[PDB]
């Protein structure tokens with residue numbers, strides 16, 4: 612969706628978003644995001660993921676993110692030049708373990724994704740850098756963003772396939788807006 616992603620990135624920039632992330636499986640879509648000024652490129656198969664990280668690295672992308680529920684894959688991504696490691700969280704204790712492991716591998720930017728703000732709060736307490744609210748309902752999203760902010764979160768991302776939710780997240784003060792491509 613080079614056209615439809617370009618649209619959302621441009622509108623979000625006009626609405627005042629300072630950090631826009633684009634997720635896609637096609638490195639050329641991410642390349643188009645990079646040339647458009649997208650801030651974070653999210654690489655959405657392990658060999659294919661590693662090849663995309665190398666391509667984006669050599670294109671000059673400064674913030675390459677990789678998502679996995681397997682810390683071993685995130686470790687491989689870090690060694691090949693990934694910047695932001697996104698821990699896909701569904702159990703609090705497994706999430707806390709992965710954050711510990713990746714920090715000790717030298718990861719300087721660890722993100723945790725969940726639709727449960729309580730998991731995100733546990734990641735915040737543990738030192739997770741970016742909390743990704745996985746949003747389905749606009750009012751639920753708004754309450755989670757406020758809770759995490761008041762609990763001290765300083766980088767809150769919102770991901771949604773609903774454009775209406777991304778717009779409202781930005782209005783509410785969400786720090787990073789994640790566009791699907």
Ligand SMILES: [Cl-]
Pocket residue numbers: 653678697724743770789
């Ligand atoms: Cl994500």
